[PDB]
Amino acid sequence: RIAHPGNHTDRIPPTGGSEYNGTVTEPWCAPAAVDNTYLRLPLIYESTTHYQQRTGRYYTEDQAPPHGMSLPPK
Amino acid sequence: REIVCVQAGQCGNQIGSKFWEVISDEHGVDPTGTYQGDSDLQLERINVYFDEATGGRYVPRSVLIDLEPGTMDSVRAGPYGQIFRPDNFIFGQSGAGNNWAKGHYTEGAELIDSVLDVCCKEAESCDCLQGFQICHSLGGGTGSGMGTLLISKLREQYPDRIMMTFSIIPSPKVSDTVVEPYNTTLSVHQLVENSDESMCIDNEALYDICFRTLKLTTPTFGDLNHLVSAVVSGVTCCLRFPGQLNSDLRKLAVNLVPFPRLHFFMMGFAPLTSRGSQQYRGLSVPELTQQMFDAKNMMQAADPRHGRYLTASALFRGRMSTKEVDEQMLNVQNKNSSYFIEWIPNNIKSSVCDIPPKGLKMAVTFIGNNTCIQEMFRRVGEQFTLMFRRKAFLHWYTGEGMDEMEFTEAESNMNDLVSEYQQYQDATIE
Amino acid sequence: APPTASTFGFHGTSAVVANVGGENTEPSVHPAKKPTGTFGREASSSVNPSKFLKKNEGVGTASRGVPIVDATKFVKAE
Amino acid sequence: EHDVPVKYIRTLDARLLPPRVGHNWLDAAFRSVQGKPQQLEEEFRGKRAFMPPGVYDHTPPEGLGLTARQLMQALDGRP
Amino acid sequence: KRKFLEDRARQRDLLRRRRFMEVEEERRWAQQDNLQLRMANALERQKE
Amino acid sequence: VTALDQESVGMPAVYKSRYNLVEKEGPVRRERTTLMLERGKTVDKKQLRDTL
Amino acid sequence: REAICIHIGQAGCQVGNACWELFCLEHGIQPDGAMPSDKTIGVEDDAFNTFFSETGAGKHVPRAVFLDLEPTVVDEVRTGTYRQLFHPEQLISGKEDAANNYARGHYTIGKEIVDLCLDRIRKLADNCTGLQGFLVYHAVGGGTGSGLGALLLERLSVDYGKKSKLGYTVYPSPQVSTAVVEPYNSVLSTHSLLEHTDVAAMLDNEAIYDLTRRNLDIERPTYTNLNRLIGQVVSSLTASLRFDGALNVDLTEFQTNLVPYPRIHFVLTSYAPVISAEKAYHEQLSVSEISNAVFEPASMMTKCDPRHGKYMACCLMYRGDVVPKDVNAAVATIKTKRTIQFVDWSPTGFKCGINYQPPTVVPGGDLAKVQRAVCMIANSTAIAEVFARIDHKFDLMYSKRAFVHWYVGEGMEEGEFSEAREDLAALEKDYEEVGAESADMD
Amino acid sequence: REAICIHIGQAGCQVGNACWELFCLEHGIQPDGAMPSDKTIGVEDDAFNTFFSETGAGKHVPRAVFLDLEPTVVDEVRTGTYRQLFHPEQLISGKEDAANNYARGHYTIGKEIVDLCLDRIRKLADNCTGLQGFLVYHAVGGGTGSGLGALLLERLSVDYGKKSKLGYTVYPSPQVSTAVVEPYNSVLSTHSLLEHTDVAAMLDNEAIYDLTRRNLDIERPTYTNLNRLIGQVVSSLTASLRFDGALNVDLTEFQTNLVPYPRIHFVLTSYAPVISAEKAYHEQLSVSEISNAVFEPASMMTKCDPRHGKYMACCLMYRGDVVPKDVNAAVATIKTKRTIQFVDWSPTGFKCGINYQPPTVVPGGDLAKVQRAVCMIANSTAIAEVFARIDHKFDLMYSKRAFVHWYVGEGMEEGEFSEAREDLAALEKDYEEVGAESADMD
Numbered sequence A: 001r002i003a004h005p006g007n008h009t010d011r012i013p014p015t016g017g018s019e020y021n022g023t024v025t026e027p028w029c030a031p032a033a034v035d036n037t038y039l040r041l042p043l044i045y046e047s048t049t050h051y052q053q054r055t056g057r058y059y060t061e062d063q064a065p066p067h068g069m070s071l072p073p074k
Numbered sequence B: 001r002e003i004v005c006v007q008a009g010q011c012g013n014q015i016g017s018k019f020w021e022v023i024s025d026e027h028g029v030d031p032t033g034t035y036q037g038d039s040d041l042q043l044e045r046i047n048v049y050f051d052e053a054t055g056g057r058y059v060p061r062s063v064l065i066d067l068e069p070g071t072m073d074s075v076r077a078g079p080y081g082q083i084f085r086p087d088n089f090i091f092g093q094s095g096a097g098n099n100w101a102k103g104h105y106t107e108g109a110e111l112i113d114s115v116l117d118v119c120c121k122e123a124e125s126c127d128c129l130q131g132f133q134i135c136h137s138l139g140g141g142t143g144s145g146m147g148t149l150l151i152s153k154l155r156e157q158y159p160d161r162i163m164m165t166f167s168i169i170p171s172p173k174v175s176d177t178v179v180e181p182y183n184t185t186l187s188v189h190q191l192v193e194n195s196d197e198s199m200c201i202d203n204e205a206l207y208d209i210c211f212r213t214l215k216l217t218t219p220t221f222g223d224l225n226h227l228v229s230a231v232v233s234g235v236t237c238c239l240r241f242p243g244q245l246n247s248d249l250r251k252l253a254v255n256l257v258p259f260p261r262l263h264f265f266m267m268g269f270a271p272l273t274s275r276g277s278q279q280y281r282g283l284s285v286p287e288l289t290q291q292m293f294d295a296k297n298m299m300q301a302a303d304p305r306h307g308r309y310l311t312a313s314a315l316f317r318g319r320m321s322t323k324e325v326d327e328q329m330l331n332v333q334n335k336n337s338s339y340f341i342e343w344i345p346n347n348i349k350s351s352v353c354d355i356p357p358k359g360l361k362m363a364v365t366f367i368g369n370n371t372c373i374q375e376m377f378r379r380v381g382e383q384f385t386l387m388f389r390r391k392a393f394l395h396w397y398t399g400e401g402m403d404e405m406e407f408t409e410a411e412s413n414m415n416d417l418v419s420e421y422q423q424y425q426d427a428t429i430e
Numbered sequence C: 001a002p003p004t005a006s007t008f009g010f011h012g013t014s015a016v017v018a019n020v021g022g023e024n025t026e027p028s029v030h031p032a033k034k035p036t037g038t039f040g041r042e043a044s045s046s047v048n049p050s051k052f053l054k055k056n057e058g059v060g061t062a063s064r065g066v067p068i069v070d071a072t073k074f075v076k077a078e
Numbered sequence D: 001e002h003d004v005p006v007k008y009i010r011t012l013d014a015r016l017l018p019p020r021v022g023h024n025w026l027d028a029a030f031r032s033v034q035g036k037p038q039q040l041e042e043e044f045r046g047k048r049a050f051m052p053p054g055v056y057d058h059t060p061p062e063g064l065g066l067t068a069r070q071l072m073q074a075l076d077g078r079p
Numbered sequence E: 001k002r003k004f005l006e007d008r009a010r011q012r013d014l015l016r017r018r019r020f021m022e023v024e025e026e027r028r029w030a031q032q033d034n035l036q037l038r039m040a041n042a043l044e045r046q047k048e
Numbered sequence F: 001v002t003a004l005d006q007e008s009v010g011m012p013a014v015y016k017s018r019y020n021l022v023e024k025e026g027p028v029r030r031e032r033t034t035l036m037l038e039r040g041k042t043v044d045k046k047q048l049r050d051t052l
Numbered sequence G, H: 001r002e003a004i005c006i007h008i009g010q011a012g013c014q015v016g017n018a019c020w021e022l023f024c025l026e027h028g029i030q031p032d033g034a035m036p037s038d039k040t041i042g043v044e045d046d047a048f049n050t051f052f053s054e055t056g057a058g059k060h061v062p063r064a065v066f067l068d069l070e071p072t073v074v075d076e077v078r079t080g081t082y083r084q085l086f087h088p089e090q091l092i093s094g095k096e097d098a099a100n101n102y103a104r105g106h107y108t109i110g111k112e113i114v115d116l117c118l119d120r121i122r123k124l125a126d127n128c129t130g131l132q133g134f135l136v137y138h139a140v141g142g143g144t145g146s147g148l149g150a151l152l153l154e155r156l157s158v159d160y161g162k163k164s165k166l167g168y169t170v171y172p173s174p175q176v177s178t179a180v181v182e183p184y185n186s187v188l189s190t191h192s193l194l195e196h197t198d199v200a201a202m203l204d205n206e207a208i209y210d211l212t213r214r215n216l217d218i219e220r221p222t223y224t225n226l227n228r229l230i231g232q233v234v235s236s237l238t239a240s241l242r243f244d245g246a247l248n249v250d251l252t253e254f255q256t257n258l259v260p261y262p263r264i265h266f267v268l269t270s271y272a273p274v275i276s277a278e279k280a281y282h283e284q285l286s287v288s289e290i291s292n293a294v295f296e297p298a299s300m301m302t303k304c305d306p307r308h309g310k311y312m313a314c315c316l317m318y319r320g321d322v323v324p325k326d327v328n329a330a331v332a333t334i335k336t337k338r339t340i341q342f343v344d345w346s347p348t349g350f351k352c353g354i355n356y357q358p359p360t361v362v363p364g365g366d367l368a369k370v371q372r373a374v375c376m377i378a379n380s381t382a383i384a385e386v387f388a389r390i391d392h393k394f395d396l397m398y399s400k401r402a403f404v405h406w407y408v409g410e411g412m413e414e415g416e417f418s419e420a421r422e423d424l425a426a427l428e429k430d431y432e433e434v435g436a437e438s439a440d441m442d
C-alpha cells in the first residue's frame, strides 16, 4: 500500500524517518561541488561497518546521532 | 600504498587526461587543484594517487612522455591541465613516424634517461610502492617502442613490485596503421617476457558499445576514453575505499594467472544502458550479473563461446548483500558449465566495495582470462607472415638497425604462446 | 648483529618496526639497500640492435616462478 | 525542507551532471576556435606560466583551558 | 514476566516501523536517478 | 601533583622531605598516641557488652 | 576467570566488532569505556573481570588484540565509535596483505609482524591472575589468516605449553566459494590446526545464510548478521564463567568431557532459539522444545549431516530460566530417538551446564527476546565427509600443478603439498577407524 | 648529600640546561634564584642542599660548571632565561673548537683551558661538607667532549683521588651518524673512560629517538625531548638522596652492588613509564607493570639487546607511592622469566630502593603525570656487542689510514690507534671471560 497508493482512501501515513538528505534534524544545504547537488551525500559516503557501529545501539536509525561527514563521527 | 602512472603516446596522453578528470572528481579536487570535497572518506586515501602541495593543493603522481608535444600542449591548455607538475612533461624534437625501431632505438635511447630519472624520483618518495601502471597502444610507434623500453628498464630496477599495463590493440576489420603487425608482434613479445598482467581493449568494441548499447547520436573519443577511465578507475577502487571484502592488484594476479605466460585478460563493465531504456529496469545484483556476461557490455571482438574460462574476477561497488553475489556466481557457473575449465573447482573471485562511482547506486567491473584470445594472436601472426615473406615494408626497420633475427624470435614466441593456450584448452582429467 | 627494534634504515619497504627478535636478518623482504636508487643508470649506452632480447630470456621475478628471496641474506621462517 | 529546491530543477545548466560517457556537451570538436597552442615551448622558454592561488586558514583553537592559555602566553638596578 | 512481555511488544512495534522505512527509502533513490535523467534530456534537445 | 583532598591551599601538596616530615608528622602522631592513651583508660564492660 | 581473545585478518576483526559490542552491552560498559556514573545498581559485581580490566582511572578496557596485515580494517576500527574503548597498542596493523598465499603469510610477511603480536600477548598474560585459555578467531581460506594464524599458534604452543587454545574457524563452504586457491590454503592449514589446537569449532557461511533465510525472515543477509550469531555462541559458552547458576562448567571440564582421544578434537556447533519477533508470539519456547531444536540438522552452523555419523560426546549449555529436572527430562527424551546414535563405547553421552542469566538483546539485532536458550557443541564421526571434498578438489587441481609456481616463488618446497595431503588422509582414516564396532570379541 | 655536575661540550651543556630546568621546577626555585613567599616549602627546609647553596640573602645558586671551547652555546645560556641564576664565573668558554680531533682537544687546546676548570671546581669543592661524587655529561663522538673530558677526568682523578666519578656518555649510534670520524674519537675515548670512571652509563641517541617515536607519539622529535628524558633519569637516580623513603640507596650503594670486578663497570640504563598522556589514561600503571617494562629491550636508552648476554647485577630504584610487596612480587616474577638469565655466580641479583616522592612533570607533552616510576641500572655482558660495531667501523677506516694525518699533525703518535684498538679488544675479551660458566669443578 505504501508502494502503490493508487486511489485508496485508506492511505498509510508517513513514518517521518526517511528524508532525501538523510538527516531528520538538519535541512538541505548547498554542496561545495556543483555536480553534487542531486546526490544523497550523507548516505553514499559511509562504510558498512561504521554504519553498524553507529546504528547498533538503537532500535531505529533515526534515533542515532547524525553522521556529520567527519572522519571521527560527531 | 601508492601507484605511479605512465602515459605514453597520443592514445595514452588522451586517455590519461580523462582518467585524471575522473579521479580528481572522485576525491573532490577542484580543477584549480584545491580540495573542495564534502566527506573525510574522500580525503583519507588521497595519498594513493596525489602528492600534497602547500596550502590545500594536490598534485597528481603521473609522468607524461611523447616525442612531439602537440597532444601534451593540448592537454596542458585543457580544462584540468593546470593540475599537472610542469617538470613532468618530457618531449623530443622529431616524431616516432609510427615505426617501432625508431621509437625504441633512436629517439627512445635519446630521451629514456630523463624518463627513468623522473620515474625513479617519483618512486623513491613513496613510503611503500605498489606496481606501476602504463597506458599505451601496441599498434603505434612511440607508445609501443618507448612503452616496452621503459617497462624493460623498470622490470630490471623493480623486480619485486607488480607490473600492470592497459593496452589498445588492432581491430579485426579495419586498420588504423599499415605497419600494425610488426609493431604489435614485437610489443607482444616484449610484454609476454616482461609483464605480470596485461589488459586488452578493441576500439571496434567501444564503437559498438556507443552505437548499439548507449544509442549516442554523436559520440566522440571523449566517450571512449571515459569508458576506459571507468574500468581503469574501477579495478583500483578497493585499494582506496573501505569495503566488506577488500582486494588488491597482487591478489587479482594470484587468482587470475594459472601459469606465468597466461597473463593477457579480457575486460568488461556492466551498467551500460540508454536513457530511454533506463526507466524500464531497476538496478539489482541479478541485473548487473546478467549485463556483466552480456556481450553488449564486453570490450573485445573475440567471443567466449569459442573458448573456455580458466578464471574470472568481478569487483562490485556499492552497498549490497554478499549472499546475492555468491549465489549469482554459483548459478552462472552451474548453468554454463561447458564454458568453464573443469579441472579448476571455482573460476570466479568476487570482491565488494562500499563506495560507488558518483551518480550510480552500484557498478561492477569484470576481468576475464579466456582462451579465445588465441584467435587474435593467430590473426596477427598470419598478417606478419604475409608481410615478412615478401619484405613488404622491412627496409624501414632494417635501416634503423634491427637484425631480421629479432622478427623470427618474436614470431616463434607468439606461436608458442598460441600453442600453450590451445594445449590448456583441450586438456582433460582422464 | 643488527640493532633490534629500530625505526631507522628501512624506508621504502613493507616493514614497520625492524628486527624485534634481534636475529641476524635483513629488516625486510624487499631490498632495503640496492645497487642504484634515485641516481639511476645509463640506459642510452646499454641498448643496441645487435644484442636483442631472446626467447625465454626475460627478467626472473617471483611471479615467473624463481625464488628471489633465497638469493638474499633474509632468514625465512622454518 | 529536505528536498532539493526548485531553483536547481527549473534551469538548464550542464555543470550539475558529473562526467560520464554520453555527457559530451562541453568538450573539443564543438568549440568555435580549434587552433593548436604552442604553450610548452613558451613555458620552457620562460615567458608564460600558471600559478593558482592557495588557501590558508587562521582560526584559533577553542576550548583551551587556563593552563594552555598561560603556556601560549609564555611562548635597572634600582632598589 | 509482565516486564518481559512489555519489552517484546515495544520491540515488535519498532521492527514494523523499520520495515516501513526501507520501502519509504527506495522511492527517494528513484527520484535521485530521475533528476539527472531529465536534465540530460533537456541538454540534448538544446544541442539539436 | 594535586592533593587527594580538595580545599587544600598548599600548592606543593606532596613535598615530603626530612624537615617537612618531622615538623608535620611529629604533632599528628603524638596527638594520636596521647588520644589513644587517655581514651582507652576509661574502659566500660557494660557498654562493650551492649555494642556486642 | 580470565580469557584472552585474538582476532586475525578480516573475518576475525569483523567478528570481533560484533563480539565486543555484545560484551559491552551485556555488562553495561558504554562505548567510551566509562560505566554510567549515575547508575547505582547497589553492588558493583565482579562479572566483567572475565573480559575487562580497569586502567586505574576507572575505565574498562578489553582483553583483546586485533591483527591484520592490511591497514584498512584496523584503521576503520581506530576511527569508528569505539575508538576510546581499545588501547591503541592492541590494534596492530601492517602495510600490505599476504595476497591469498599461505606461503607469503607463513614465510615472507607474517615473520616480520609476529614479534609485536607476541609482545602484546605477553603484556596481556602479565595482567591476569587466573588465565584459563585463549580464544582465536580466523578464516583458513585467506592468506594472512592461514599463514600468520598457523605461525602464531606454533609460537604460542612452544612458549605457553599446557595453556589451552580454542579456535573458531571459518572453513571453505562445500559449493559457495570466494577464491580459487582455497583448497591449497585449507590443506596447508589443517596440519597446524591438528597439532596446535585443543578444540576446534568449524563454521561455514553457507549454513548461517541458510539459517538466516529459513529461521529469521531476512531476504538479503550480510556479514553483520553472521557475526552477531557467532558473538551469541561465544557469549553462551563463556556465560558459565560470568554469572550465577546451578551447575557451572569450567573450560577444563569442557575439554575433559568433549575430547576422547588427543587427535579427535574437531567439533560441530549449533544454537536453538534463532527466531524472529513475529514468530515468537505464536509459540511457547520451553526447555524440551529448544533441546529438540539443537538436534535437528536444520539448526547446525556447519554444512554436515550428523545422521551420517555417530556421536561420541555432547556438551549442552543452558542459559536463562531453566530447572535441572527439565534438562534431565529433555535429555531422557532425546536418548529414545533411533535416528540419533552414539558409539557403543560411549554410554554416558551428555555433559550439562545451567546458568541463570538470559541472553542479551541487541537494539538493532534481528533475534527476538527470549527467556531461555541452549547451545550445543558435539564431537561426531560425520566430519569425515567434510575432509573428503577438500581432498578431492586438491587432487583435481594439483594433478596439473595449476598455481604451484606462486607458492614455490614465495618460499615453499613443492613437497609440502604432498606431505599435508597425506597427513589429512591419515586423519580421515582415523575418523573411519574410531567409528568401527568392536566386533573383535566374536 | 651534595653532588656536583660537570657539563662538557655541546651535548653536555644542552643536557645540563634541560637538567637544571627540571631541578629548579621540582624544588621550586624561581629562575631569579629566589623562592616565592606563598609556597608552603618553608624557609628551614633543606632538600635543595644536594643541588643549591644560598649566599645568606636567600638567593639560590647551583653546583655546576659549563665547559666549552666554542662560545656560542654558553653565550646562548648567558642570554637565555636563566641568565641571573648562574654565577658568571661558572660559565667558562674558549675561543675555538677541537674540530672533531681528539688530539686537538687533548694536546693542543684543552691544555690551555683545563687549569681554569680546576680552579673553579676547587672553588666549588671548598664550599661543600659532604660532596659524594661528580656527575659528568659529554659526548665521545666530538673532539672537545672526548679530548677535554678525558684530560679533565685524568686531572680530577689525580687531584681529588677517592671521590667517585659517574659518567653519562652519548656514544656513536650504530647506524645513525653525524660525522665521519666518530669511530676514532670513540675508540681513543674508551681508554680514558675505562681507567678513570667508577661506573659508566651508556646512551645512544638512536635509542632515545626510537623511544620518543614508538612510545611517545611525537612525529618530529628534537634534542630537547631527549635531554628532558635524560634529566628525568638523573632526577630519579638522585631522588634517593633528597627525599624520605622506606628503603634508601646512597650513591655508594650503586657502585657496591652493581660492580663485581673493578673493570666491569659499564652499565645499561632504562626508564619505565615513558608514555604519552593519551596512552597513560588507557592503561593502569601498577608496580609490576613498570618493573616488567624496565626489562624489555624496547625500553632501553642504549642500543643493545640484553637477551644476547647474561646479567650480573641489577639495581632497581622505585620512587613514589609504592609498597614493598609489589617490589618483592615483581622481582620474583622477573626471576621466574626464562628469557632473563643471570650468571650462576650471582645468585642475589637485585638491589632495591623505595622513595615516597613521585616524579616531577615538566610543562610540555613529553611525559604523562604519574604517581610512581621505576628506574634501572644494570650490568650485562651484552654491552660487548655495542663496542664490536665501532671496532668494525674503525677497522674499515684504519685499513686505508683514511684520516690519520690530522691526528698525527695535531700531536699524536700513530701507535696510539693500535694501542687503543687493542685495549678495547681486551675489554671485549674481559666480557667474554666473565660470562663463561664455571666448568672448573668437572
Ligand SMILES: Nc1nc2c(ncn2[C@@H]2O[C@H](COP(=O)(O)OP(=O)(O)OP(=O)(O)O)[C@@H](O)[C@H]2O)c(=O)[nH]1
Binding pocket: G008, G009, G010, G011, G012, G014, G015, G069, G070, G097, G098, G099, G100, G101, G139, G141, G142, G143, G144, G145, G146, G170, G178, G205, G223, G226, G227
Ligand atoms: N562469516 C564471515 N566470513 C568472512 C568475513 N570476512 C571474510 N570472510 C570469509 O573468509 C574468507 C576470506 O578470508 P579473509 O579473511 O578475507 O582472508 P584474509 O585474512 O584477509 O587474508 P588476506 O587476503 O591475505 O589478507 C572467505 O570465505 C570470506 O567469505 C566475515 O566478516 N564474516
Ligand SMILES: Nc1nc2c(ncn2[C@@H]2O[C@H](COP(=O)(O)OP(=O)(O)OP(=O)(O)O)[C@@H](O)[C@H]2O)c(=O)[nH]1
Binding pocket: H008, H009, H010, H011, H012, H014, H015, H069, H070, H097, H098, H099, H100, H101, H139, H141, H142, H143, H144, H145, H146, H170, H172, H173, H178, H205, H223, H226, H227
Ligand atoms: N642527546 C643529545 N646528543 C647531542 C646533542 N648535541 C650533540 N649531540 C650528539 O653528539 C655528537 C656530536 O658531538 P658534539 O657535542 O657536537 O661534539 P663537541 O663536544 O661539540 O666537539 P667539537 O665539535 O669539537 O666542539 C653527535 O652524535 C650528536 O648527535 C644534544 O644536545 N643532545
Ligand SMILES: Nc1nc2c(ncn2[C@@H]2O[C@H](COP(=O)(O)OP(=O)(O)O)[C@@H](O)[C@H]2O)c(=O)[nH]1
Binding pocket: B008, B009, B010, B011, B012, B014, B015, B096, B098, B137, B139, B140, B141, B142, B143, B144, B168, B170, B176, B177, B203, B221, B224, B225
Ligand atoms: N580509444 C582510443 N584509441 C586511440 C586514441 N588515439 C589513438 N588511438 C588509436 O591508437 C592507434 C594509434 O596509435 P598512436 O597513439 O597514434 O601511436 P603513436 O604514434 O606512437 O603515439 C590507432 O589504432 C588509433 O585508433 C584515443 O584517444 N582513444
Ligand SMILES: [Mg+2]
Binding pocket: B246, G009, G010, G070, G097, G142, G144
Ligand atoms: Mg585481507
Ligand SMILES: [Mg+2]
Binding pocket: H009, H010, H070, H097, H142, H144
Ligand atoms: Mg662543538
